[PDB]
């Protein structure tokens, strides 16, 4: 996260960390949506361009963290995966369209003041909150600059941008399954996700029922906090039927 600050304890209790066993390194960010499901970006698991194709056995999910590198003994929980599901039309060949994937934990986790799932949005909440100018929050333990790793979870609040601007900022083809967010060069405010933050959650707080919803997933950007550029996120609501389906089909 660039130009973001340190989070507070229990500020994003649904923030998960995908950890690799060997070598032991941070891979991506993810979020907890029930006591057995974690959601992330599919490129965090499969990205053939760079021979990336992890399997159940190769990852660890760490929930309840604040610190990036410490094993916060008695606060975080580490789970193993039972199954990983990548969206069937995930497009890694062109624009990372439908960048989403679900992970089933071996055993359910218990919630605590530090572990609590986030809400997935419903047509109405999507409709009322995904509006340009509205801010969302992104969190992660990713890099602090483009080219500088934090010791604690970082947070930054970014505005959603109007699609035409998003499109006119890159040469990549944008689809309706993505939205972009960030400040205009003109707004003298910055912030952005960066390497290491991928897979994590973009959330908004409903002013109707005070709950936090996860509207997008950190998917991609060109550089970190470059002016005239933005971050793109998977549109969770547009792919929610898929979600429901693997869940009530497999658990």
């Amino acid at each position: 996260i660039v130009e973001g600050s340190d989070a507070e304890i229990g500020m994003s209790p649904w923030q998960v960390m995908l950890f690799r066993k060997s070598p032991q390194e941070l891979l991506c960010g993810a979020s907890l949506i029930s006591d057995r499901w974690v959601l992330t970006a599919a490129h965090c698991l499969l990205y053939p361009p760079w021979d990336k194709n992890f399997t159940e056995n190769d990852l660890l999910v760490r929930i309840g963290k604040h610190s990036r590198t410490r094993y916060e003994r008695n606060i975080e929980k580490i789970s193993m995966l039972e199954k990983i599901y990548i969206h069937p039309r995930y497009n890694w060949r062109e624009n990372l369209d439908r960048d989403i994937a679900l992970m089933k934990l071996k055993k359910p986790v218990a919630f605590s003041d530090y572990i609590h799932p986030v809400c997935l949005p419903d047509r109405e909440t999507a409709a009322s909150l995904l509006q340009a100018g509205y801010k969302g929050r992104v969190t992660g333990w990713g890099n602090l600059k483009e080219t500088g790793q934090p010791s604690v979870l970082q947070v930054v609040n970014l505005p959603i941008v109007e699609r035409p601007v998003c499109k006119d900022s890159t040469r990549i083809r944008i689809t309706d399954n993505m939205f972009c967010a960030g400040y205009k060069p003109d707004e003298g405010k910055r912030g952005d996700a960066c390497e290491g933050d991928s897979g994590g959650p973009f959330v908004m707080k409903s002013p109707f029922n005070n709950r936090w919803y996860q509207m997008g997933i950190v998917s991609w950007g060109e550089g970190c906090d470059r002016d005239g550029k933005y971050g793109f996120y998977t549109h969770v609501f547009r792919l929610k039927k898929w979600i429901q389906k693997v869940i009530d089909q497999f658990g």
Binding site: F19, Q24, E25, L60, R68, T69, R70, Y71, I78, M80
Partner: peptide, 11 residues
């Protein structure tokens, strides 16, 4: 940089 995590989580 990461601190060691309990062996039981690898197996």
């Amino acid at each position: 940089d990461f601190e060691e995590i309990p062996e039981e989580y690898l197996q």
